[PDB]
A paper describes a structure:
[name] is a G-protein that functions as a molecular switch regulating cellular proliferation in growth factor signaling pathways. Mutations in [name] impair the cycling of [name] between its GTP-bound active state and GDP-bound inactive state, leading to dysregulated cellular growth and oncogenesis. The switch-II pocket is a shallow pocket between the effector protein-engaging switch-II loop of [name] (residues A59–Y64), the α2-helix (S65–T74), and the α3-helix (N86–K104). Upon ligand binding, this pocket undergoes significant conformational rearrangement [e.g., increasing in size from 150 to 280 Å3 in the case of sotorasib (3)].
Author numbering: 0 to 169
Write the structure that this text describes.
Amino acid sequence: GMTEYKLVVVGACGVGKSALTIQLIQNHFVDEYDPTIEDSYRKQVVIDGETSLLDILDTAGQEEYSAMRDQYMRTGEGFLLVFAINNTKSFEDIHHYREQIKRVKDSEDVPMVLVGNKSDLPSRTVDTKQAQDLARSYGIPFIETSAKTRQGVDDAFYTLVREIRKHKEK
Ligand SMILES: *CCC(=O)N1CC2(CCN(c3nc(N4CCCC4)nc(-c4c(C)ccc5[nH]ncc45)c3C#N)C2)C1
Ligand SMILES: Nc1nc2c(ncn2[C@@H]2O[C@H](COP(=O)(O)OP(=O)(O)O)[C@@H](O)[C@H]2O)c(=O)[nH]1
Ligand SMILES: [Mg+2]
């Protein structure tokens, strides 16, 4: 059979949400993508032997509270919390993204993966320990990715699917 998964990618402007999503859906690096374009993108893959349809919402546009965005999170089954390793502000924001998702879901048990993107860049500002410790406090996996080289990209998305599978068994 097959399983469908609703994924939502969140994080600050410019962390690589679209680039990561496009690497998953199209298998190459797209370095310029309109920051106002928010959409869902479907991609059929195979994960641990089962056909899996990933509907991936790539959040974008205006950072503004809206009921429409609350509905995205309510519908969403798992969330990539993305920051850039060379952007301390985007890492600081992760807390707020998690808090907002937790608010909507009304739960502390929500499938999430912390993603540190732009791992290819030489000048990092957010240390791995800081991210590892934050993920530990949340009880979620941490995966370093590069949308540029594709390092860790499948691992990030597939790990999130595996976290959703576990949650669904409860
Ligand atoms: C450069 C453009 C870009 O890629 N952006 C990502 C957004 C659009 C969606 N964003 C967003 N931001 C926030 N913030 C709260 C703390 C700092 C920014 N919250 C939400 C959000 C969440 C995570 C959950 C529920 C929400 N309801 N309204 C907003 C909600 C989103 C979203 N989506 C930044 C700019
Ligand atoms: N070096 C590097 N650049 C990246 C990576 N991911 C995204 N970028 C670049 O970062 C900028 C923002 O990427 P984008 O996908 O638009 O981020 P979004 O605003 O979160 O969707 C663009 O100039 C991308 O080319 C990465 O893994 N490595
Ligand atoms: Mg984008």
